[PDB]
Amino acid sequence: ERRTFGSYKIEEITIKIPILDDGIFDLINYLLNGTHFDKTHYFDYSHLPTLERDFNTASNYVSENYSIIVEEIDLNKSESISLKSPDFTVVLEYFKKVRELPLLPIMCRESEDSISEDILEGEGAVIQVLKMFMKGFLVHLGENPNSYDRQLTIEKYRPLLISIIGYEFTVNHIYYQLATFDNYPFDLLRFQLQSLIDIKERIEKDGLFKVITTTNARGQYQSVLLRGINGSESYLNLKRYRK
Amino acid sequence: ERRTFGSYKIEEITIKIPILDDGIFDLINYLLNGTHFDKTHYFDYSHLPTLERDFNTASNYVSENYSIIVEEIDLNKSESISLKSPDFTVVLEYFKKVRELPLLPIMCRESEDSISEDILEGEGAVIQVLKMFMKGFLVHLGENPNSYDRQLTIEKYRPLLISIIGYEFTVNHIYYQLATFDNYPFDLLRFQLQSLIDIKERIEKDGLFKVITTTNARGQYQSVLLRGINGSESYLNLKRYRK
Structure with missing residues (x-):
């Protein structure tokens, strides 16, 4: 059952069609539950040093801010997380x-x-x-x-990627390209991965985000766009994750 | 109605969903009918010099080899072309x-x-x-x-791209990458287009194609694979084109 940190799994569901088990749902569940890195699904993390140092310290903040939401929780009263961007709004x-x-x-x-x-x-x-x-x-x-890689995209890893480039900016070209191109095939990305080694003035001159806001009595709806590495002002939508 | 040579068209068919009008179907129809470049759908072709020189000379060969197939054609007896690779087999x-x-x-x-x-x-x-x-x-x-570009791929331009790299080899890195990655998004390709400016020994040492052949009484079926720029031995299937 145990898998390395960040590792995905390609699922075959005969209708054998590919289904990406990205494992984002897990990451949030563990952090909200405030689980320590010592007793998780997550091996030799030489490539990821200070992983237990940074997992627990993050697990603290995520659980402590969840207990506020849980203070008004009921005994008689789901595990189907959703994610809003760029504030990394756990839904x-x-x-x-x-x-x-x-x-x-x-x-x-x-x-x-x-x-x-x-x-x-x-x-x-x-x-x-x-x-x-x-x-x-x-x-x-x-x-x-x-062989199924060609049928997979970065599409579910967007909120993670947006919050990474977002915090860094308001407080990496590879993270940025990936955040712009959610339509990135797994096989093409692997091929161009090591080839991605290198701040654009115009994009920073206008920032990474546009926030279109409209109203209509009960209506008051925002919509965040992302100023891309190509220029494209792509819409940022809520991404849902299951068990 | 007139469009420049090679130009596509993004169609909106409200169910507004994107539908690529690649225009390959046209190219073959004109060549098989042996139409001259002077009276076609196909402007200032400064970027494509010797286009009428090479269109007509190709239209000659395509029509002259079609008249052989048409020699045994009936008066009482479609326009829904299909394409087999790598022999550029018009179906x-x-x-x-x-x-x-x-x-x-x-x-x-x-x-x-x-x-x-x-x-x-x-x-x-x-x-x-x-x-x-x-x-x-x-x-x-x-x-x-x-805005729909992100929802489009090079997938229909494969037979053209395979025959280009194939003839050149048995008789370009940009054509090769495109032939390997049929899953290429339109927006990503535009972004990386000018960035594609540069013969791999292993791929040439084994050639561009693998030809898996099986038998079973009535059975005798071939299957051509393509040794990719990444390595991937991708299956080459028949591509159908409509009006």
Whole structure:
């Protein structure tokens, strides 16, 4: 059952069609439950040093901010996580027999010296857990090729990738390209992975995000776009993850 | 109605979903009908010089080899072309109220000095029409971006791309990469297009194609694979094109 940090799994479900078991759902579940790295699904992490150092410190902040949401939780009252970008807003949908959780709020913080070390340190560790999961994914990708790879995309790893480039900016070209091109095939990415070795003025001159906001009585809906490495102002939508 | 040589068209069919009007179906129809470049759908072709010189000379060979297939054609007896690779085998499926046509046979020709100029010249012009259509496609791609581009792939331009790299070999890194990665997104390709500027020994040491052949009484089925720029021995399947 145990798999290395960041590693995916290609599932065959005969209708044998590929289904990516990205494992993001797990990462959030463990952090929200505040599990220590010593007793997880997650081996020789020489490629990922300070993984237990940064996993636990992030697990602290994620669980401590979840207990606030859990303070008003019921005994009689799901495990089908969803993720909003760029604030890394964990979306929980509870059943009787819905709340948000922005782990890395990039969009709103005009309080530089006001963000305390009890909040700031935990985020610095949440981006280091995210950065390491993506390094752990690209390592597993490059390491093992497969015939179904050509039928797979970076599409589910977007919120992780956006929050990585986002925090770094408001507080890497490979992370940026990957965040812009969610349509990236697994086989093409493996091929071009080592070839990706190199701040664009215009994109930084206008920032990474556009926030289109509309109203209509009950209506008050925002929509975040991402200024891409190509230029494309791509829409950022909520990504759902299952067991 | 008139469009530049190689240019595609993104169609919106509200269910508005993207549908690529690649225009390959046209190219073959014109060549089989042996139409001259002077009276076609196909502008200032400064980027494609010797286009009428090479279109007509190819149109000659394609029509002259079609008249052989048409010699045994009926008065009472479709326009839904299909393409087999790597021999550039045009597949026609006729109705009463099915034949092949290998325009560029790369797979079988142990007759070097035996291929006459009445055949050889026409093929050299058929690969020059194919090469120019793909140059004409990448020019149109780079020239005009679109929001649906991210939902489009090189997948239908494969037989053209395979025959280009195939003839060149049995008689370009950008054509090769494109032939290997049929899963190439339009937006990613545009982004990396000018970045593609540079013969791998191993791939040439084993050649570009593998030909798996099996038998079973009525059975006698071949299957061509393509040794990719990444290594991948990808299956080459028949591609169908409509009006």
